[PDB]
Design a protein around this ligand. Structure first.
Ligand SMILES: O=C([O-])C(=O)/C=C/CC(=O)c1ccccc1
Ligand SMILES: O=C([O-])C(=O)/C=C/CC(=O)c1ccccc1
Lengths: 276, 276
């Protein structure tokens, strides 16, 4: 699946990184969600053609995910800072400056982190159901809805469970499910995933109110009103905690804003990027 | 001022009602704010040309306001229901059906009320810093920032105070201030205003969560993040209390969304109306 995009690869301080790209113009980098089997292709396939008509759009696979290297977690710690540093490295490896950047959930943690740490690279930020204020306690507090993703058994039913919980009125195709299931099952990505989630569960995906307020560039915060993974009140706190943030809440919409309402998602983001 | 629009008048069950209109296509009715001196012309002058390029746009003066009749409050009670019934009457007087409707603050109370009471007339609703969940206690709780409008002395400084509190980074022209000051001073509108606000202060501008949830048509809820009159948390509650509501929060923006960011306001509303 997803062979309509050309797989490309580049070295990011020793991490071999898969990405796809399309279109021309200013660079736009998309960062996918952190659930089992997720990658750039599968998260953003529906948005890519629309974005490509106006920008040079780019979706990479996060360290531990997809076709990017998944270093053995016997020797590699799967921390937020590792994702964050990976992203920063990726942007530099490609020679990109002044990017627009969109992050989904954990990809949102990562996009935020990179915006905090290397803001000179990033002109505009979009946080889409971003896990940027989810403490360890919040994880425990939302343990029931997070289980499908956090304690993923490795089964097909498990993957259907993950997607049911990422969505409000979206039926994925068998092909989508099969793709993420099969991807999830590679032994290296399985182990990197368990480490990834175990660390998330213990440490949270979190920045402090003061950290969020220090972001130096324009921000668009998006969220599905029915999102069970990053609940709308968390998205609302992000809007309030980030002085300059535009906020936009989507009704009849679960976590997967970009897939449930691909045109509206693209419209609102492209408009925010000055492309409409 | 505002003579670039043609004043027109029509009888709404014995209330003689001023309105302006422009453009062609589907009807769009705008309902102005309830502060001293407010009317359709002055609230929506900057938005009217933009809306006119795509819709038949219409701004009327609420009973007690502008150039609409201000019946003696010795014999007329200035209740929400009176505004609400006035609006419903206006829509019918004009023979309009399936309108798009936008209400600012008290104009928002009125637009909501009419959407609850006569939903068959209204295809789409926009609440812009709408006073639709402000209880008597909330009024008292926000008494300090509401004073400029609630206990308006009648002076020019008083009117500058009203506008400073309606805005975050907007300097109105002398002409805007003078217009609203002079309008505020007509003896009939002064008395209707005191009655209007006295009743607002005692009864609130309020609908119950259950009432809000019963709205039957699509809804767009807008709000300036720095709004001191209808604070952003109240706008956020509206978004959450209305299942189908889209939500959009504007940064660096006070109550007067339509004047501080006229293009963004028009863009977002026209998009929601299906005109972009
Ligand atoms: O496509 C996906 O895997 C996706 O959008 C996942 C979102 C879940 C996620 O990254 C998350 C993890 C822990 C807590 C909250 C959110
Ligand atoms: O232009 C205006 O007068 C305007 O936008 C006024 C808003 C204030 C308003 O109607 C209001 C009254 C009481 C409480 C909250 C809000």
């Amino acid at each position: 699946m997803f062979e309509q995009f050309e797989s490309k690869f580049i070295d990011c301080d020793g991490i071999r990184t898969h990405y796809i790209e399309m279109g021309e113009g200013d660079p736009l980098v998309l960062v996918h969600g952190g659930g089992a089997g997720a990658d750039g292709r599968s998260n953003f396939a529906d948005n890519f053609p629309i974005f490509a008509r106006h920008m040079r759009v780019i979706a990479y696979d996060m360290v531990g995910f997809g076709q990017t290297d998944a270093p053995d977690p016997a020797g590699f710690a799967y921390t937020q800072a590792a994702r964050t540093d990976h992203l920063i490295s990726f942007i530099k490896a490609l020679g990109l400056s002044k990017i627009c950047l969109i992050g989904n959930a954990m990809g949102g943690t990562t996009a935020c982190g990179a915006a905090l740490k290397a803001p000179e690279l990033i002109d505009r930020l979009v946080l889409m159901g971003a896990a940027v204020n989810i403490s360890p306690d919040d994880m425990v507090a939302n343990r029931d809805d997070l289980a499908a993703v956090m304690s993923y058994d490795g089964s097909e039913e498990g993957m259907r469970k993950i997607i049911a919980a990422l969505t409000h009125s979206y039926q994925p195709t068998d092909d989508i499910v099969h793709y993420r299931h099969e991807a999830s099952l590679r032994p290296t990505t399985t182990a990197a995933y368990k480490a990834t989630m175990g660390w998330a569960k213990q440490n949270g995906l979190y920045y402090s109110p003061e950290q969020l307020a220090s972001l130096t560039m324009p921000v668009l915060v998006l969220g599905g009103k029915n999102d069970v993974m990053v609940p709308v009140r968390k998205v609302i706190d992000q809007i309030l905690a980030i002085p300059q943030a535009i906020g936009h809440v989507f009704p009849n919409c679960g976590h997967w804003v970009m897939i449930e309402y691909p045109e509206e998602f693209c419209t609102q983001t492209l408009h925010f990027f000055g492309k409409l």
